[model samples]
Target: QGTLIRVTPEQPTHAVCVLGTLTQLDICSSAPEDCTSFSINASPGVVVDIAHSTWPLDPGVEVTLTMKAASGSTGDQKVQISYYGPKTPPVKALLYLTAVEISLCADITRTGKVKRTWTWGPCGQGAILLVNCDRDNLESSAMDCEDDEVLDSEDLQDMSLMTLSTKTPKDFFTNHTLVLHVARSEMDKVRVFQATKCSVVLGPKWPSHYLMVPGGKHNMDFYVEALAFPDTDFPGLITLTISLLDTSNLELPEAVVFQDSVVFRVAPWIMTPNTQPPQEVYACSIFENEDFLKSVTTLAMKAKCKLTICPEEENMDDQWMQDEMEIGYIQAPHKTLPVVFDSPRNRGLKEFPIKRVMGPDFGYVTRGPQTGGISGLDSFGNLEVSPPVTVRGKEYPLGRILFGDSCYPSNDSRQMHQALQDFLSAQQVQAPVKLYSDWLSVGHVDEFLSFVPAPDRKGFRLLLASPRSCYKLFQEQQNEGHGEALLFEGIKKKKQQKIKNILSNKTLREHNSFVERCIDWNRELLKRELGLAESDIIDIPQLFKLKEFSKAEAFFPNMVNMLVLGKHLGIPKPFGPVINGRCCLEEKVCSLLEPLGLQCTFINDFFTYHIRHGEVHCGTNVRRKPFSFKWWNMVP
Candidate 1:
């Protein structure tokens, strides 16, 4: 019920692998080899494996073999190993079971069930348990089935015992790999899961929802891919989920939730939703309310709205727009956002996105923006509200929107945040960042901001002068770098998973999904490695076309790569009420950010930039007033 686990430490040249999925067919009956009953949920800390620490696990390390069900119903369980350090001391352990036990004792069949199960390694991880289960089922075994599983072939580095028969499907015969094509005029079935989370989920895949053609008119198309075979420029993914049930209560709100992305041919797996109209994706959304019932028209309301405001605009500035000559600004975060929601890490959205239309008002409209507000309404039937709508004499008076995507209330209701501004407004519920935040909130003047040239230089004319010499050079580089170091003391918030650990960071949550799948497979190899890396960090329209201030100041030696404010702080759950980076008055709502027309901009004071310190703090004992280490010789 709960088991969001972690062991960390990878990258030795990075190539990773360690699989063990043999499909519950349980192997070791003398033909191709099969065996069963070997589950462990935790308790194996000190297992070492790190191949190529520069490419040298030489003959070992490449792990990740999941399937824990042990609790007295034990059968030949013996999977111990370990190695702990990231600053060691989770009760410090250097190594264990060195005499070898990287998985060897197995058994479990009589019908407790077993098949296609055997996968093992990209190489090296330490700690896992199953001393007998019932520590309340390994304290709720988590990490949401490794975000609905995929890595199956165990593709070497040491993998043994894999079986997949009874035809196929029950998740590739092993630990979760999407396989349930059970038929019976399939209905009462609404489901959408959508998760690929790249870096490795290599697949054989299938699930274009019965490949189109079940009674009645239909059209078809093609273009379904899932490649990464033998590694061609590596990184590839397919992630999807869609459901709609009712053969009689199969469970799900589903009318629709479909999914996208799958190409670069793993070998023409074709099934293209017929030039995009629907070949799959219906995790449910048929809204059959007499075809959207109508009768809307009930005027007698008090209005004065403040959403999608257009009468005028101004608030947010690099001096009135410079996200590079301005293409939509707003972005600044220092990592730190994690609590692991099925952390393999992060892929939740089986359809749920009406997350509070836009909150934080009252207190005189949260103190800034709002010129004439009024509340109280019964326009309950809004027949196109928002007109001159007077209340002093009642002219056209009916402006409803008392708050959000309106009309979801009026007795008919509907509607979501977890931060990076609730992940850029529930990421416009992925209709493609909601068509780029709805073409940048209505004023869409062909927006663009991919400029690059600034690395340093700030103006308001020398930041008005001594911003205290930039706050004493970022307070002597946080009194020489231990910045109050709690450095994740064994990961807190019940070991929250990560998007920069709510900002605690153990190397920016291992580079937010490997730099988003290496910019989706060579986004021009990081656009030519940032156009030719000398490495002073860039992004956010290249610091908005710097123009000067020394290219933003030659990027203070890559200020820990905020890479244009971590891609506009695209989610780390900052909707509010405490996860440290503030806000959490504890009222909850954010259904995929209310159908993507986001409006919540609730920020109550928090803006910190000053991070300078290349060194001027002298004292190698021989100097004091004229020192220089370039802040401990710039640490890259």
Candidate 2:
């Protein structure tokens, strides 16, 4: 009989055999069956042994042979087994064995499998790469990836682990080499490091290849880190390869005996919505916005949240803090931190996110066009996100991203940069939805909508600005003989208009009719895309007037564009006509939201913000806690 056996470096193989009686024994001669003697022989570098050298020539008894190949050796060997019985002739079995020194592996599956190939699915094999964006050194100003050395033990947790395994002899180190490499195009995306006896080994550096050495251990570890985030020019997925080279022949070129690879995907940046609990609030301090800043401070104190006020010297009169940057975060299994996404507006606050916000543990990212002109739509106020929701059967556990775009597709229209849109789409967790905000003067999504936490029904409610509701409230006041009540009541240097005169203006009524239509278009979109019902929406009394280029601006401060911090809301002071010694606009908004466990505080931004086409939300920003869900578990 003949058999084939395969052996890997330093691993053993076993074989078993049994001798049966031949039928011709009874007819040829009258002889008793006896035991058989067994022996085994093997070629050099192959060790062989047997558990039992002699066994009865019967069905029950068997002989066991064990064989092993020498370490770091790769070649063929032959093993022969012979048996001899008292009455039977001799018989032999031949085994052809091949030994290989290929044992490179990595735990790409995360189940301790140390597999060679990677796939992605609900059950797949792959590794996760984290962007080493957090600062590790307190004395240094650069990110961890920018430094060649590990500054802190905590920073090591942010890198993924890989291993090189070997069990070869000392002589094998003289002729063979191992190489860890990435593709040329992908070299800029990631960096690899090896923890050595003296110091860290950074590669594809000076000495790109490693000579296999007998380090008294079988497994060696290496750390991998991502350098850049996923963008339009580069997808997030990256692969790294480890190869074993054979250089035993002096005159011939070295050849690769075995090669293995693992895949890694970088983590995506995620945005937080208003419904989340606020951690900190940001606003600007300018000469004209002193009163506005004081009112915001009061609201923040009442909410029990930290407040940060950028001084006029640093902000340089950039009161629109919300338009400068959007606060988000990136997360991996090992680490997470807040990251600020700066817009391309490049105003007086252009350096705020990098200089004031980006520090130790806080990251900064931005994108801009090479040569095209930027508009108001490029500002961050046009961007917002919804709370986690389920639409039809699909669930968006991380919520959906919403941004303002043109009413119709056109290259000439002002819109958010395509590079920014591509980055958001590549994230895949928060599917993005576009809304029509280009019709407004500032072209911002925050101009007309805000979300506030509620005790019932979806845990929150969507607030929408409505000219229809404003007109109806005015008509009610006129019918009650309160037409003589005046708007802009206690404000200095502002014209006061009586309710009767406002209701009689034909041009103002026509302007509101157009504004109502524009808002209704977005109302339907939010309802469908957010899977929200009509009961989940609250209409705040608001009106609009046409400005230059037929663009709409709020007639009064827009109440829906308010800042939400938990149950506390900082609303813009709308100086509507007063009745019973109360501003009807404030009274109406409180009646709608206070019943749902909300507190409304009116902040006067008329001179500083309102006249500039902004409100409380436009002048402020918030950073919130991230979601508890692990993003790597997501299929995308």
Candidate 3:
């Protein structure tokens, strides 16, 4: 004998109301394989859909969606689906359905208790409610907020501040005290979270009023505090339900006349991609001097990186290609991306002959002489393409490039930033792009920042310049009464003259202050924009030297900007000053880096870079090995 049972609507089968146009009838079967041809019949205004209407249904297969109301559907939604086949006896189930739409802001007439959803994430909040949290009750019908849009996280690691600052229409709560609470979505249950209470006045002129929070109110501005989770990737939901009733009579907990809900979500964090590893180092022949070549070989041998020799534009004796241009693109799969010049010697480089000169892939598309460097080019994903596009032929990709406003009056640097942004966008290459304050005379990022992979091999770390550390050492030497001797310790006629100017110059005070300010701003940028933690950053102790004209500044053996080759770090040799009777600049750097599992190679820079207004990095380039694409995997 075949056993038959009623899986849904057991015994009394009390009717239940659902929140939307659809509802389901859940079922189970002991002899599911014997049942066949299932069908549903509902009230005239409602239609039903049944899944898997065939026999030989697996006995262990159980799914909740047995019957559903069709689109534009309504109450009395679910109906018992009857099935008949050869082995089928009588199978019956009582069916009843309820569907209601509620908005938080407007006409929710059926007053009693209600529930809704509020979906949000790390990027920001993107939802609005008129009464019920559904398509018909949105704050703006034109655009729905994305899951990844975070208006503000208020912090980097904790996601502490998930505040939704919204304005409510006057009298929306007239005769009612509305209260909101959030909770997490738990299957087959409601697991609400507590609202985080805070004290901060945000909306000016719109004083606290009908707009209510856990402890306060404003005329229009309402704050909804969200609970924070360590990670947001797990499939989950942030639920919000509003209770409406008379004024708080602290004695009665059952005074709520109406209640309903809305939903939100968690927008996870993002990490930068693994940029290609060092393969070659490119530098231009600026001085036509042997020491310039010496700079090239010293760096090349230290890192064991590739060498690319290119001629700079004769316009300026020192072209600042590291400032005015980049050599090759880092489009890797191990193949170097073709080099492109907005104005021109840069190399992502592999297997090319030594000093094999390559031209910019899309040679200066603009007419005027090139004025900016790859240093000024910073990339970001999913940004509004800013106006004033300079590159006419190329289409920028999914990312946008930011341009630094410069101390130089030529509009050329801005144009180069836009042109390269367009060119790279068209090429469909993705990288972490940002433009920094062009406050320093040479405003490239390498002067203050560099990034290298961690020794443990999972993530990356930043190499930062510590003007603080360098200045402290400077003060210590001077306090010991060895200041004058230390200043002239590195005997070179050119640098000695430059040193004299710094010691007696009128702008020395102003210059030093500006230098200090620039470093502070750049450090904040690294922390805020990049979300780099203190643990992820290592400091390089290098001090800046003031220049008289063009408002230029150079680092004193700026080791932070040096080139990296796998486990080896190539630094510029320290030229002057003995601190604590035995401390050298190179030794100071090596000591800090040993914990990171990095060894150092100090290339002499006195003749090549120290007096020339640039350092090892500005004079060298590396073709790094490429890793897998992680752009798509990144958080939006």
Candidate 4:
């Protein structure tokens, strides 16, 4: 006789049997050494098989039996194995089998696989997490994720969906429980919800675990919302797990029988370049720039963009709005909203981005140095991004981020804070390109280069400040007998200089020669990094003067440091020599850009911004549309 065996559908069970010998069975002394018959009987949905069932047991060989129960069929089933010797009593074994299947899955690939595990690669499988940063409620000033309730049906689109699946017999639910959970560290980063009985179920709290009800359905659906963005502390990847626990044992704690996990990475914040369509323009209102602000308002109106003026009380007379904050946006597959990146220059407008700009759908972020003092290079004015471009064969569909840094490496040389740089690089999509801008007194990249939309090749042109171009124009006027034309001709209380006199100044000529060299160095970098030909660049006529430490500042209002708003441009009045009743510098710019369908509006920032080492672009900022290309698709 053989002992009884027990089996469960969760896994297979094995059994071994030894053949009986005549000497061991005294009454069967005349029986044969081998049994020629063997048989097995099992209930429905249970299977039993034996290897070498007919046997004289060899030296080390024994009957091998394996048993299993089918999925979705769970119950107490019986199996009997029997064998007989020539003259011995029959021997039998009994088996009790239980069948059950427990599984958890999610459609991580969006192809509806309901996978049990997750992987990440260009071709591998994983889920995408979107920040619920959009306002779904019209009257409430809170982001959809910040609200405790899903106020609108449309808000569901912003969340990622997961499914839990299991198949077991009716009694299995009574002895087992399912739980969905996220790690405690990730509590603030994400939220999970269950929809049941036509109502949404919020997690009781964190450690966020929700007990699932097996209500006559084999599959359950869950919605997940990403609540925060990646920063220096967080890498943005998150994991969610669901477990099936056996709870029938009264004295022991519940044990996990099966579990499935899915991974997700949050979308990154992206900065918009000038090539995108303008949606809104921001400027500071101060006593000195009243005229400048009016001109900006007019330009905004013509561009069909909303204009926001920060009052002096908020800005504390900080007219350099562009330096205080950079306007960008964050996006997921279903939602997007404008976000402002505050600079560490903590000047008069330090609180503006958080206090005034951050509301409802608008988000705000800032990164500052932990140990070192902030520099002019840390201002947002030093940061910019190119329009989408293809360099050689590689394509930057979302464009590349560009920022200013000292060309010569030294401990004392100013640079953007490392925290901000790391944050931008971690974004991966917009690979950052460092440029040489410490040669400028203010150390901002916008002082020399800008992008304006054109209807031609690449849909935009790279505008570079060219002292060489400015001198060439001046020489042309002198050679044409218009050298007597005077700069600042109508400006009150300012001494005017004739074109001939400016050309004759040897010190000024040398200073510009050095300035041209610095600009040319960056021009070559932009050409190489942005994949531009000579024809793709426009050399805007502008001159520079050498300041302390041999750093350069705009000699006159820099033409390249102008604000771009679709087809219109707000440029600083250069007050160049008047020829034929018009400033030759203004006329030169119009001729260069007008054919490209650009309209130039000269804003006189001479006393207000230009004298303070800034220009129209440095004084104002614009928020533009985001790229259509999704960031998650980037290989990096």
Best by TM-score: 2
Query: 469, model 2: CA deviation in Å?
Result: 1.3
lDDT of 3 by residue, 1-636 (tens): 011223442332433232232334444442244565454555554544444433333344333332232223222354554555577764655555433222353111111112133322233332321101011112322111112122233211111123332222233233336555443233211122123333332111212223253221232222332222112233324444555454535576535544554453322111212234566665666664466566556656765666766554432355343443333332211112333222322232211211132321111111122332534223111111121111233322222233344434464443234444444433222333454445545555566666665665325566777766766655555566655534434555734423323344546445656776767765675465444457867777766656644343654667776766656766777665654454356667878887777777776666656566567766655544433432222233
lDDT of each: 0.18, 0.75, 0.42, 0.76
Candidate 4 per-residue lDDT over residues 1-636, each given as its tens digit: 233344322334432211110001111222223444445566664444333334442322233233343233343565654446677566655544444444445555545334533344346566777777766556655567775577776677667777765555556567777777778788778887776622334332565464756533376777777877787678888788766677878899987655666787787889988999999999898886788989999999999998898999998889999998998887754467788888888889887786667666676666876235788999988999999999998888888999999887797678888888888887777889999999899999999999999999999999999988888999999999998988788788788988899999999999999888888899899989989999889999998899898899988898899999999999999998988888999999999999999999999998889888999999999999888776665655
Q: What is the TM-score of each candidate against the true structure?
A: 0.15, 0.82, 0.44, 0.81
For candidate 1, what is the TM-score? 0.15
For residue 553, model 1's alpha carbon misses the true position, in angstroms, by 24
Residues 492-530, candidate 1: write the lDDT tens digits: 332322222223443323333332332233223322322
Per-residue error for 138 in candidate 3, Å, reads 61
Ranking by lDDT: 4, 2, 3, 1
RMSD of 1: 30.6
lDDT of 3 at 525: 57
| Candidate 3 TM-score, C-alpha based | 0.44
Model 2 per-residue lDDT tens digits across residues 1-636: 222233211223332110111101111111123425544566774554323244433333333223353333332455655555768675555554434343445555544334444454447767777777766567766777875677777677777777776555555556667777678777777877776721344433423446445622367777778888887777788787766676778999977655666788887889999999898899989977788888888888887888998898898789999998999998865567898888888887877887788767787777777345688888999999998888877777788999998888776567888878888887778889999988798999898888888888888898989999999999899999999999999797989999999999999999999989988999999989989999999999999999887888999999989999989999999988889989999999999999999999999989889988899999999999898876665554
For each of the candidates, the C-alpha root-mean-square deviation to the true structure, in angstroms, is: 30.6, 8.3, 21.3, 7.7
| Whole-model alpha-carbon lDDT for candidate 3 | 0.42
